Amino acid sequence: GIFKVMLVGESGVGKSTLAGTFGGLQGDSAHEPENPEDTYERRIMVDKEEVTLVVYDIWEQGDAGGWLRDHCLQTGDAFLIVFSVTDRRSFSKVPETLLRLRAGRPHHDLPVILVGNKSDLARSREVSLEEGRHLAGTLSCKHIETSAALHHNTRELFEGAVRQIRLRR
Ligand SMILES: Nc1nc2c(ncn2[C@@H]2O[C@H](COP(=O)(O)OP(=O)(O)O)[C@@H](O)[C@H]2O)c(=O)[nH]1
Ligand SMILES: [Mg+2]
């Protein structure tokens, strides 16, 4: 099968940087509509089963990005809601973002992971591992911390996404 995994969240959290750690073949305007710019495709093996995974980084801020956020929600098989552990403001918006996704696909059970990125930036940390874990508990979803910069837990993130999807299948 083909799985479509969508990186979403506030600007600056590390969505594009996370996308780059997937190691996928990057799309472009020449391969629109199915592999546009800011998409990354790769065949991967998870738990002895291969899947073609397309990782999307098209969650654009502002009015001009509305149709892309809609396309993102309409077509995603799973959603990675990314905040930065160095940016409490991004963390604070996690529940609203999650509820918009859930409410926007009311007939579907949406596979989601809450991603606390920039875990390497110890000096700049504003949100704790514990806090992020607790909010995920509250919101009924899996939590993981990543350093997109160091590729720490990034294999686990994308493998986890595939697992999330398979467990509704
Ligand atoms: N130290 C550190 N910096 C990061 C990490 N992820 C992203 N960055 C940096 O944060 C900035 C914003 O990241 P970017 O991927 O463009 O964020 P986006 O707006 O969510 O796409 C860039 O300068 C990245 O290099 C991380 O895990 N650790
Ligand atoms: Mg970006």
Measured between alpha carbons, how far is 108 from 102 in angstroms, rounded to an integer?
Answer: 8
Alpha carbon 126 to chain centroid, angstroms: 20
Ligand 1 lined by 20 (C-beta under 6 Å): no
The whole-angstrom separation of Cα 58 and Cα 61 is 9
| CATH number reported for the structural domain that contains residue 50 in this entry | 3.40.50.300
Cβ of 116 closer than 6 Å to ligand 1, yes or no, is: no
The finding on whether 13 has its CB within 6 A of some atom of ligand 1 is yes
Number of domains composing the chain: 1
Ligand nearest to the CA of 8: 1
In angstroms, this model's resolution equals: 1.8
Q: For 68, how many CA atoms within 13 A lie in the half-sphere containing its CB? A: 18
Q: Determine if residue 1 is labeled as part of a ligand binding site.
A: no
- Was 9 annotated as part of a binding site? yes
What is d(CA 142, CA 150) in angstroms, rounded to the nearest whole number?
Answer: 21
Domain residue limits at 91:
1-169
Omega prior to 111 cis, within 30 of 0: no
* 120 appears as a binding residue in the annotation: yes
